[PDB]
Amino acid sequence: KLHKEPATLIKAIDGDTLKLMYKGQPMTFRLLLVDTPETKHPKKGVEKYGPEASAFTKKMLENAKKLEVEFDKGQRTDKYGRGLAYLYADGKMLNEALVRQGLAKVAYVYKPNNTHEQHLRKSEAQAKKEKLNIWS
């Protein structure tokens, strides 16, 4: 079964990429199953809702009492050396929260790293139904 382990925030970089202390080491983490709009796109500077997503993530993590990371059952790092995980702030999944608010869409999915896929797609469908943010 997936297990939750503790982590400490170092810096939020944008909506879906974070620097955390994990096991005593500084690491970049990329959120599983979701994509927030870019703020640093080499091409097109900020995408609509990029700054919003990024501040949402920064607020939720900076104000948390406890952060936890949850790896899925497949690869735990990507080709750029980032940890691939679900992030929980006081027990609430950051990946889901972003999607539920219309600030992220569900990513292209890669088995077997897809354990929370149905829950996130459920939240995405609700955000679209409510026409929130990127869905407006």
UniProtKB/Swiss-Prot annotation:
<feature type="active site">
    <location>
        <position position="38"/>
    </location>
</feature>
<feature type="compositionally biased region" description="Basic and acidic residues">
    <location>
        <begin position="116"/>
        <end position="132"/>
    </location>
</feature>
<feature type="binding site">
    <location>
        <position position="16"/>
    </location>
    <ligand>
        <name>Ca(2+)</name>
    </ligand>
</feature>
<feature type="active site">
    <location>
        <position position="82"/>
    </location>
</feature>
<feature type="active site">
    <location>
        <position position="30"/>
    </location>
</feature>
<protein>
    <recommendedName>
        <fullName>Nuclease A</fullName>
    </recommendedName>
</protein>
<feature type="binding site">
    <location>
        <position position="36"/>
    </location>
    <ligand>
        <name>Ca(2+)</name>
    </ligand>
</feature>
<feature type="binding site">
    <location>
        <position position="35"/>
    </location>
    <ligand>
        <name>Ca(2+)</name>
    </ligand>
</feature>
<feature type="region of interest" description="Disordered">
    <location>
        <begin position="116"/>
        <end position="136"/>
    </location>
</feature>
